[PDB]
């Protein structure tokens, strides 16, 4: 929507994850996940707008370590993912994910999710794995006060989005009701699985 | 044929994989990946017969480093698997796997394969997984001159087999024509999917 494709922010060295994603997540986790409502609470609009700016200027690590409002870092990550010219799960798989997540039989649904994920382009799959492992630690932090369902409600519009750049009002709405379930199944896929995308050799 | 259930060769400790499969796979990955025709070339039954005894009967770990001809270890592994009381993929799911592999729609078929792998008894799933990871490397070794299809030809009878102990010569023959596709699909499920099962827990 705003700047560019996910593939444009990753190197070529697996795991292919944008460094903006890596630095944001690391920062958040390095602080212990002690804050309440991570990813739910918005960060000061002015704090978040600067970062987006003085980001291309000075290096990342020094940046984020200085941010007082952690939530501003959460909005930074979320905005970045939301502004990819195409959703993290890609336009061309957007329907496969919703449909797979809609299967009522859990075991059968999980199976269809593994298939949809197997179809993700590598960079998207690595970035997804990394992001998911993170959100599982968040939902398991007794402090954050955010569970899988809450987080799925938030990242629904973020990584799932729609199948086209600009949906009609009716499709947009029906879509938004089906996105949270997609993120829930993904977060239900084991940490033992997602971790495998962090392999290096 | 010449052994008991798989469950007998594993402990409650995960991943549940028989010592013999782990030792064979490890010796074959040491000096077997350079050898052409792995799993396709057979080993002097003289040797295989010996080891299979010094390995299981003696309940001791025979330093497979002593065995010059690496093809003997490949045949010993297939032998162990083939001769289990029931195929690695079980009787119960024998038809389910074949059918799944036969579904004409790609996406649906793959999904069916995940569904089926998920129905496997745990011991069967870890062993299968450990084995699938090993065979993917073999197919990835330029020297072995074995691709997914080749290994599927060989392991079709080794791990899929039949859905009954004593099938008639026709069912037997129809089955043999459907096994290759099953092992082919399995070998196509992603390294990251199989590897989640190897995590110590």
Curated annotation (Swiss-Prot), chains A, B:
Q: For this protein, what post-translational modification is recorded in UniProt?
A: Phosphorylated at multiple sites in the midbody during cytokinesis. Phosphorylation on multiple serine residues by PLK1 enhances its association with ECT2 and is critical for cleavage furrow formation.
Rho-GAP domain ranges (all copies): 4-194
Looking at the UniProt record, the site noted as Arginine finger sits at 40
The conditions that induce or repress this protein are given as: Expression is down-regulated during macrophage differention of HL-60 cells.
Query: Where expressed (tissues)?
Result: Highly expressed in testis, thymus and placenta. Expressed at lower levels in spleen and peripheral blood lymphocytes. In testis, expression is restricted to germ cells with the highest levels of expression found in spermatocytes. Expression is regulated in a cell cycle-dependent manner and peaks during G2/M phase.
Record location of the Glycyl lysine isopeptide (Lys-Gly) (interchain with G-Cter in SUMO2) cross-link: 59
Which compartment or compartments is the protein found in? Nucleus; Cytoplasm; Cytoplasm, Cytoskeleton, Spindle; Cytoplasmic vesicle, Secretory vesicle, Acrosome
List Phosphoserine occurrences by residue. 42, 65
State the disease link.
Answer: Anemia, congenital dyserythropoietic, 3B, autosomal recessive: An autosomal recessive blood disorder characterized by marked dyserythropoiesis, hemolytic anemia, macrocytosis in the peripheral blood, and giant multinucleated erythroblasts in the bone marrow.
Q: What is known of its domains?
A: The coiled coil region is indispensible for localization to the midbody during cytokinesis.
Outline the subunit composition. Answer: Heterotetramer of two molecules each of RACGAP1 and KIF23. Found in the centralspindlin complex. Associates with alpha-, beta- and gamma-tubulin and microtubules. Interacts via its Rho-GAP domain with RND2. Associates with AURKB during M phase. Interacts via its Rho-GAP domain and basic region with PRC1. The interaction with PRC1 inhibits its GAP activity towards CDC42 in vitro, which may be required for maintaining normal spindle morphology. Interacts with SLC26A8 via its N-terminus.
Please describe what this protein does.
Component of the centralspindlin complex that serves as a microtubule-dependent and Rho-mediated signaling required for the myosin contractile ring formation during the cell cycle cytokinesis. Required for proper attachment of the midbody to the cell membrane during cytokinesis. Sequentially binds to ECT2 and RAB11FIP3 which regulates cleavage furrow ingression and abscission during cytokinesis. Plays key roles in controlling cell growth and differentiation of hematopoietic cells through mechanisms other than regulating Rac GTPase activity. Has a critical role in erythropoiesis.
Q: What is the name of this protein?
A: Rac GTPase-activating protein 1
Task: Give the classification, highest ranks.
Answer: Eukaryota, Metazoa, Chordata, Craniata, Vertebrata
Q: Which gene encodes it?
A: RACGAP1
Q: Which residues of the full protein are shown?
A: 346 to 546 of 632
């Amino acid at each position: 929507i705003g700047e560019g494709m996910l593939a444009d922010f990753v190197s070529q060295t697996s795991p292919m994850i944008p460094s903006i994603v890596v630095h944001c997540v690391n920062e958040i986790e390095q602080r212990g996940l002690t804050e309440t409502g991570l990813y739910r609470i918005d960060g000061c609009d002015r704090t978040v707008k600067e970062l987006k700016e003085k980001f291309l200027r000075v290096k990342t690590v020094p940046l984020l370590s200085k941010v007082d409002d952690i939530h501003a870092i959460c909005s930074l990550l979320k905005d970045f993912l939301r502004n990819l010219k195409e959703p993290l799960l890609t336009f061309r798989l957007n329907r496969a994910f919703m449909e797979a997540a809609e299967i009522t039989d859990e075991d059968n649904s999980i199976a269809a999710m593994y298939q949809a994920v197997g179809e993700l382009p590598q960079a998207n799959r690595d970035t997804l794995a990394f992001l998911m492992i993170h959100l599982q630690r968040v939902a398991q932090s007794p402090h954050t006060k955010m569970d899988v369902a809450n987080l799925a409600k938030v990242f629904g519009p973020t990584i799932v989005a729609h199948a086209v750049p600009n949906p009609d009002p009716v499709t947009m709405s029906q879509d938004i009701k089906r996105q949270p379930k997609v993120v829930e199944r993904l977060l239900s896929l084991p940490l033992e699985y997602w971790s495998q995308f962090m392999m290096v050799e």
